[PDB]
Design a protein around this nucleic acid. Structure first.
Ligand code: ANP
Ligand code: SF4
Lengths: 760, 834
DNA sequence: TTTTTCTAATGCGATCGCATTAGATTTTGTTT
């Protein structure tokens, strides 16, 4: 009745009877086309209304694209014979805590703390802890262990008292045992485990201040929502009386707090008349460090039973639509030994990083200019591989608000006003495109600033009232006009009279000052003149959304705040807002490409110790904030037994072999990043890997991957003292300004804007 | 008798005044009755009526909270009782039964064990009035033979929204016009003449119903979808700006009707003041900065003397206002008179200038101390006899009254000053000195406040699917909404009908595409394209940006340059090419020196820096550096203690513990772990010096170096840490460092600091190259990196490195290399290499 | 004028402790 015929493999997911059901949706098989064709079949054949439907996803982008295929296929269901509710996982628990929030007594007025303002609140419970921490580290380095245990105790539901007795029955197996041959390194293992129990009373003063202020986290939401469903069995009773068909998408990324919340509510053996469908594959489970549950695909079927002991059914649904063959024979051999999907390459190895980027800038510029996306694991790595492809002539879209050169000239110049001791935001102003100072006039302000300026006296400086000979009081008192040039004295006086006016608007309300500095600067007119004509009128998207964050914050001191808040956002958040474009070659990373497709895909740097990222990897016995697997949930993550050791040659052999199982398991999370990169292709595929790196004295070869893919493609282009190149830059408009100077439906606007300007 | 006259605008409250004159009143709002007599005294409520019949909120809120703390609840709610979010769900259960007249016993008949406990709590609250049970008590009090005979005409005028307990205070007095309007929640009179709606607008409303229009109106209905939340907020500020300026309907004839003003209407009024369109417009009184300027003078007077931290807040406030760069001119000119060599604080010096008279040096900074003396003499020589006396003795308030006249920045700033200053005077008279301090345009609005407006032009913003039909459920613990109906999409559709009824000229319905609701598509069939991603504006800082975008590009150029010519002739900052940013010139482009007998002065700690990046040298020196960096001034306190020649091991440790308290650490658990880390960094020195006293011999400690290494001829200036003397007559060089991480041995002999000290030992200021050590206090013993004695060949290989680099500081256009130190540099954001 | 990271390896030598240091210092969403 208006669509395509469904596949014979899709005619079992669509016509499956009500009851719990699993769909192992493979790579590129389109689990959204074959999901809106079950909401329709569970409406047109009875069994529901279109208001008893619930759809849950992780991201909000994959939620808005599920309304647009439920609502479409239901308007064409009403053409031949109430709207469905789709929402994310973390917004389904904010709903569940505004209704039933007072049973387990959490307030309904509870604000949600931001990543930046959460760091602001735990830094002050570490800097105000009366005690003796005795930790080699610093504040602002032990408050990033508080925020990583308390974000991992409220994710496995541990309740902070099981963690106090873990260091025992391992600190006695080192001392009370005898040798068979304390070893000075196994004590260093034991040093980190007596460090958690020294910062347990730190993270418990964090929870007692997040309840005297009634604020929560995003991981604190699913902690309270998980407990409420299990404790009170009346919450799930009034939700199976409202929603009678529930959808769960990308369920392989579901953590452990989102698992016993959705299994007590929706059918842990509750009501067999409910049609419940959870999808996702076990083989694109690429996160593992963020939601981290290695379960939920094996432990679903015994978890959502038929309420009479019989476990659920499981459906294959494996087909590839946006994928050609000869790129499946690789991806079936990558994921071999870890039902293979069936359908409906140019390997290389250079010996220079800077020259292997020329090899991928050949194919990405020869097939473009003859008539695509580059998947790089590290974002920092992505930036260099955009100049080697700009010179070839291909347009580039590589995908920080506080680093945008119109916002960053408004963060500074708001900092010269407040404190005239930040000198690094005076050289941003004096050397910028407005008032270009030369080298001889910068070095003559500093001579003015000095002429204006024992153990008991060295500590007298570095006081909060110390006089330090800053530059910015040689602007407001430049002296005698014979040290500067006649062109450079006329700008210091002008700069001085601009800051004397803007410093009187300083006790004024705070979003009325960020919109006042921005008018005195040339912003919002120089931000649009640097935009091409093909864009339209759009020039000030990411400068307006700065000021929709100053006024949200100030609901403000402008010196104590917004300078502590913006600078804590640079490190902790690395930019408050990215700012979207109108929306070329996309040089996005490998995690941002989950769910997309292109034509030519280049995976450039498959060297050793780069793609696998073996380096900078730590486990629970070499750092504090890493939650040992005795009490970790879903304990995959094999735990050492500790009970079969009576000799020191046994103990340090258990530890040195359990430290390999917890790192073999992180090489297995890499092969799932090949598979979520290889299958994003739809056409030819570009695999490569350099040999000489960039900053070594000894080369790193190919990884275990590129040495395997040469054996896959053969069972294939034969492309099989580093450098001292040092980049350095010395420190139209002239065509256009001829026309405006020589001159002296746009014309009706100018005649309208002058009707207000020439009329008091 | 009793008559009734049951559409929008059709002449109902106008007809009720004609009956109220031709024979010679009840409105329901304290604002609606203001204009209701404006039509009666030009021709010639309920909750204020039942008060006089019963004569002839936070105080209420605390009473439920106290009795919940002391207290037949079903024992599942026992954790929730001590909260303050249970005293609002319980407060609104007793309010939705008072509007419907339910006894506390009458709720106990409804039981469901949860309602029985509220049925017992309610009759316990009677035994211990309000503005809700005022009508419900006058009905229970009811004199009616004297009351009903006193009235000749009854005019209720508004019965579409009127509670049933208020429906029987009128029907008890049931002359008696019962006007109403039965849609937008006895002989009958209907009306059809709209009288306040175009026939294009009236057909849009009654199309949604599945009354005619004014034929003299000219109307249009349109629906415009945007593509982003930013573009949706700009085409509204476009449309309110096209209409006033091109067409010409004035302000206070336009309104932006939103469903709920926190979710949309607060973020939209910010994106609409920026485009020049006025908004008619909350905050506490204690947080008002101009109010607490003079309340501090009360706070000081009630304690007899002014503190340190409470006296700087007067200089940073509106009484005597200093910018942040004249504190730094006061503080240098107050430490020059009281010139102790360890100088005082700034709080302790500020009191000694207000109290007495500083007469060492004062020219313009004495005037800013008189206006703090004269206020703090009027605070010494009813409290409001001194409030105005302190107000008037200052030079304050004669400023803004000569400044609220002009000014667009200070003009609204001066008006919010006195409107917050006067609102603190009236809080003082309502108290009747220690107790007064201890106790202290376009109308954007919601649909329920948009029922008393004329409003030619109407914009209904935010008609999207998330919030105009509220699927936001309202279940709860007590179950109020299940009780309110036993005792919705079609309901919210009336609000979109009752919003478009207020528009006579035009209607604009705006959404985004974040989806369109299923109401906007139901407007399209009665109304008169892709979504917009880049919208046109009419701001004068918006044309001048687009015209400059086409005139500097890879026909229209001749059109645009004529328009920029007439913009620049009258004003419009940004149109003249003397004001562009890419058309400015450098000031000098002249070198730092000339006259080739000039001799530069290096320094051995900034000589590796100057061979590493020369732009880094020019902007760390010559200003530009983040600040104090306390890890420096602890690592220089150690160089002072070690440098003394006559102290033992216990002599040094006691002189560090006495001075350590004046070091600005937060986290006082870290100020103790950094002292014990720096006690052991003095043990590690004397453990090392006595271990190598047999090998070396001290000559002098902390020697100034100043000579001529080469003769442009360079000049070497520095302070050698500790110079030694080897057993073969040589002279090794020790540079004591206090870091943790030592430099590698491959980099320990190319070290540009030690290779200038021993180059300064040769050729005067001895005369043997000697050697070089690098002692790392911190991390057997303290690790040391060594450098060889110099050759007559490696000297010339190093003497050409000093002389070639020292000429790179002369000329303009410095190099900017990308080094290993880019991650730790202050000057990074102005780097051309980044 | 002179100053300021830390881990986990990778080699040493009298297994394992002491030492140097050469490679880096990842990826990143989730309410109103
Ligand atoms: N014959 C008339 N002469 C003058 N004005 C008229 C006439 N008929 C209607 N109007 C206008 O129509 C409006 C009457 O408003 P009214 O009927 O009181 O509003 P409503 O929509 O019924 N709401 P409410 O007043 O609260 O009951 C006024 O603006 C009148 O000026
Ligand atoms: S970023 Fe590079 S060029 Fe800029 S100051 Fe630092 S080292 Fe010099």
């Amino acid at each position: 009745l208006g669509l395509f015929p469904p596949t014979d493999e899709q005619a079992a997911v669509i016509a499956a009877p009500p009851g719990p059901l699993v769909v192992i949706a493979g790579a590129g098989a389109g689990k959204t086309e074959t999901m809106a064709a079950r909401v329709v079949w569970l409406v047109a054949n009875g069994f529901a209304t279109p208001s008893q439907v619930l759809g849950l996803t992780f991201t909000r982008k994959a939620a808005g694209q599920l309304l647009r295929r439920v609502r479409t296929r239901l308007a064409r269901l009403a053409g031949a014979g109430e709207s469905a509710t789709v929402s994310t996982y973390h917004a389904f628990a904010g709903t569940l805590l505004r209704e039933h929030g007072l049973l387990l007594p959490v307030e309904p007025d509870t604000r949600l703390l931001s990543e930046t303002e959460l760091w602001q609140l735990a830094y002050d419970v570490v800097c105000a802890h009366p005690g003796h921490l005795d930790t080699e580290k610093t504040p602002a380095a032990v408050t990033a262990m508080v925020l990583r245990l308390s974000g991992a105790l409220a994710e496995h539901l541990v309740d902070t008292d099981q963690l106090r007795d873990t260091h025992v029955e391992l600190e006695r197996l080192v001392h009370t045992l005898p040798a068979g041959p304390p070893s000075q390194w196994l004590l260093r293992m034991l040093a980190t485990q007596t460090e958690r129990t020294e910062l347990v009373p730190l993270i418990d003063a964090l929870h007692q201040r997040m309840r005297a202020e009634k604020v929560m986290d995003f991981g604190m939401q699913m902690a309270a929502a998980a407990r409420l469903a299990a404790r009170f069995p009346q919450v799930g009773e009034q939700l199976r009386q409202r929603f009678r068909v529930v959808l769960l998408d990308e369920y392989q990324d579901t953590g452990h707090a989102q698992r016993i919340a959705l299994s007590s509510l929706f059918g842990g053996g509750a009501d067999d008349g409910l049609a419940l469908t959870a999808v996702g594959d076990p083989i694109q489970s690429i996160y593992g460090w963020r939601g981290a549950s290695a379960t939920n695909l094996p432990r679903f079927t015994t978890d959502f039973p038929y309420s009479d002991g019989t476990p659920a059914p499981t459906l294959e649904l494996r087909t590839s639509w946006r994928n050609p063959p000869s790129t499946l024979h690789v991806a079936n051999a990558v994921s071999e030994e870890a039902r293979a999907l069936r359908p409906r390459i140019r390997c290389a190895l250079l010996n220079n990083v800077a020259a292997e980027r020329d090899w991928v800038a050949d194919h990405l510029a020869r097939a473009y200019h003859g008539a695509a996306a580059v998947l790089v694991r590290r974002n920092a790595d992505a930036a260099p591989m955009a100049e080697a492809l700009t010179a070839r002539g291909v347009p580039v879209e590589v995908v920080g608000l506080l680093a945008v050169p119109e916002v960053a000239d408004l963060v500074a110049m708001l900092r010269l006003i407040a404190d005239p001791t930040a000198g690094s935001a005076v050289m941003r102003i004096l050397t910028g495109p407005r008032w270009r100072f030369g080298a001889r006039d910068i070095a003559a302000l500093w001579r003015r600033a000095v002429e204006l300026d024992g153990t008991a006296d060295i500590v007298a400086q570095a006081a909060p009232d110390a006089d330090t000979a800053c530059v910015a009081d040689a602007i407001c008192d430049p002296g005698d006009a014979e040290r500067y040039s006649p062109a450079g004295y006329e700008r210091i006086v002008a700069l001085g009279r601009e800051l004397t006016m803007l410093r009187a608007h300083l006790g004024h309300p705070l979003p009325e000052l960020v919109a006042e500095v921005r008018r005195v600067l040339g912003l919002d007119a120089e931000a649009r003149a640097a935009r091409p004509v093909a864009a339209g009128w759009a020039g000030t998207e990411n400068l307006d959304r700065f000021s929709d964050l100053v006024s949200d914050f100030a609901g403000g001191a402008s010196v104590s705040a917004l300078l502590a808040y913006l600078d804590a956002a640079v490190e902790v958040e690395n930019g408050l807002a990215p700012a979207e474009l109108t929306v070329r070659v996309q040089i996005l990373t490998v995690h941002a490409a989950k769910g997309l497709e292109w034509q030519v895909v280049a995976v450039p740097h498959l060297s050793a110790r780069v793609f696998p990222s073996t380096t900078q990897a730590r486990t629970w016995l070499t750092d504090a904030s890493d939650l040992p697997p005795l009490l970790r949930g879903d304990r995959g993550v094999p735990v050492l037994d500790t009970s079969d050791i009576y000799d020191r040659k046994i103990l340090s052999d258990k530890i040195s072999d359990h430290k390999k199982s917890l790192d073999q398991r992180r090489v297995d999370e890499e092969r799932r990043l090949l598979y979520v990169a290889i299958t994003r292709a739809e056409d030819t595929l570009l695999l490569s890997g350099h040999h000489w790196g960039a900053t070594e004295s000894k080369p790193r070869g190919p990884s275990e991957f590129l040495c395997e893919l040469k054996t896959i493609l053969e069972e294939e282009i034969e492309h099989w003292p580093l450098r001292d190149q040092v980049v350095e830059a010395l420190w139209h408009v002239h065509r256009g300004a001829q026309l405006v100077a020589a001159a002296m439906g746009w014309a009706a606007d100018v005649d309208a804007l002058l009707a207000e300007r020439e009329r008091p | 008798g009793v008559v009734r006259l049951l559409g929008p605008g059709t002449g109902k409250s106008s007809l009720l005044v004609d009956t109220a004159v031709q024979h010679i009143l009840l409105t329901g709002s304290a604002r609606l009755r203001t204009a209701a007599r404006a039509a009666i005294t030009a021709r010639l409520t309920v909750h204020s009526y039942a008060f006089a019949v019963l004569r002839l909120s936070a105080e209420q809120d605390g009473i439920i909270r106290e009795l919940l703390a002391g207290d037949g609840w079903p024992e599942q709610l026992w954790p929730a009782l001590t909260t303050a979010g249970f005293a609002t769900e319980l407060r609104d259960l007793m309010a939705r039964c008072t509007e419907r007249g339910v006894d506390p016993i009458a709720l106990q008949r409804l039981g469901r064990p949860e309602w029985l406990a509220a049925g017992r709590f309610a009759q316990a609250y009677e035994q211990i009035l309000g503005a809700a049970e005022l009508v419900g008590a006058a009905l229970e009090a009811l004199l009616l033979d004297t009351e009903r005979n006193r009235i000749k005409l009854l005019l209720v005028d508004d019965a579409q929204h009127l509670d049933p307990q208020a429906a029987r205070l009128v029907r008890a007095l049931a002359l008696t016009v019962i006007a109403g309007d039965p849609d937008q929640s006895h002989p009958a009179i209907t009306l059809t003449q709209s009288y306040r709606c175009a026939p294009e607008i009236a057909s849009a409303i009654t199309g949604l119903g599945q009354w005619t229009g004014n034929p003299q109106r000219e109307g249009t209905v349109t629906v415009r979808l945007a593509a982003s939340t930013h573009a949706e907020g700009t085409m509204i500020a476009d449309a309110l700006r096209r209409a006033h300026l091109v067409d010409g309907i004035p302000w206070s004839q336009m309104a932006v009707i939103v469903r709920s003003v926190p979710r949309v209407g607060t973020a939209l009024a910010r994106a609409l003041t920026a485009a020049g369109v006025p908004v008619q417009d909350d905050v506490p009184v204690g947080r008002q900065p101009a109010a607490a300027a003079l309340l501090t003078v009360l706070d000081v007077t009630a304690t007899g003397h002014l503190d340190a931290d409470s006296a700087v807040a007067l200089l940073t406030g509106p009484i005597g206002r200093v910018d942040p760069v004249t504190l730094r001119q006061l503080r240098r000119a107050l430490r020059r008179a009281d010139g102790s060599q360890p100088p005082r604080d700034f709080g302790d010096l500020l009191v000694d200038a207000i109290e007495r008279e500083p007469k060492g040096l004062s020219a313009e900074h004495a005037r800013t101390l008189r206006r703090l003396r004269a206020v703090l003499t009027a605070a010494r020589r009813d409290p409001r006899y001194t409030l105005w006396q302190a107000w008037h003795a200052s030079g304050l308030q004669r400023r803004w009254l000569a400044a609220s006249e002009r000014g667009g920045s200070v003009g609204a700033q001066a008006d919010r000053d006195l409107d917050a200053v006067t609102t603190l005077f009236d809080v003082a008279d309502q108290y009747v000195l220690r107790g007064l301090v201890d106790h202290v345009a376009v109308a954007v609005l919601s649909v329920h406040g948009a029922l008393a407006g004329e409003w030619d032009f109407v914009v209904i913003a935010g008609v999207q699917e998330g919030l105009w039909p509220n699927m936001i459920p309202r279940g709860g613990v007590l179950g109020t909404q299940h009780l309110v109906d036993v005792l919705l999409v079609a309901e919210e559709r009336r609000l979109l009908m009752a919003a478009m009824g207020r528009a006579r000229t035009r209607v604009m319905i705006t959404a985004v595409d974040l989806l369109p609701s299923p109401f906007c598509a139901e407007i399209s069939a009665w109304a008169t394209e892709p979504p917009l991603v880049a919208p046109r504006v009419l701001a004068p800082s918006a044309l001048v940006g687009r015209l400059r975008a086409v005139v500097c590009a890879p026909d229209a150029r001749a059109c645009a340059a004529a328009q920029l010519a007439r913009l620049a002739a009258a004003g419009v900052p940004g149109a003249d090419p003397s004001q562009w940013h890419a058309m400015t010139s450098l000031t000098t482009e002249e070198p730092l020196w000339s006259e080739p007998g000039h001799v530069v002065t290096l320094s051995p700690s900034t000589l590796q820096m100057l061979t590493d990046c020369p732009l880094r040298w020019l902007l760390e020196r010559h200003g530009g550096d983040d600040g104090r960096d306390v890890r420096s001034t602890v690592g220089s306190l150690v160089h002072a203690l070690v440098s003394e020649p006559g102290k033992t091991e216990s002599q040094l440790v006691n002189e560090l513990e006495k001075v350590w308290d004046d070091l600005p650490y937060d986290a006082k658990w870290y100020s103790d772990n950094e002292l014990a880390r720096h006690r052991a960094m003095l043990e590690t020195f004397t453990r090392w010096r006595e271990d190598t006293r047999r090998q070396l011999t001290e000559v002098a400690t902390e020697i100034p170096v100043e000579g001529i290494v080469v003769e442009p001829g360079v000049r070497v200036r520095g302070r050698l840490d500790r110079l030694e003397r080897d057993e073969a007559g040589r002279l090794v060089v020790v540079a004591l460092k206090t870091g943790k991480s030592p430099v590698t041995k491959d980099d320990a002999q190319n070290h540009a600091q030690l290779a200038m000290y021993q180059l300064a030992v040769a050729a005067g200021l001895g005369d043997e190259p000697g050697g070089g050590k690098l002692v790392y206090l911190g991390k057997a013993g303290a690790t040391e990196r060594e450098q060889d004695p110099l050759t007559p060949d490696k000297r010339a290989e190093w003497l050409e490195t000093v002389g070639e680099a020292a000429a790179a500081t002369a000329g303009p256009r410095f190099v900017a290399r990308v080094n290993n130190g880019c991650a730790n540099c202050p000057v990074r954001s102005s780097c051309p290499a980044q």
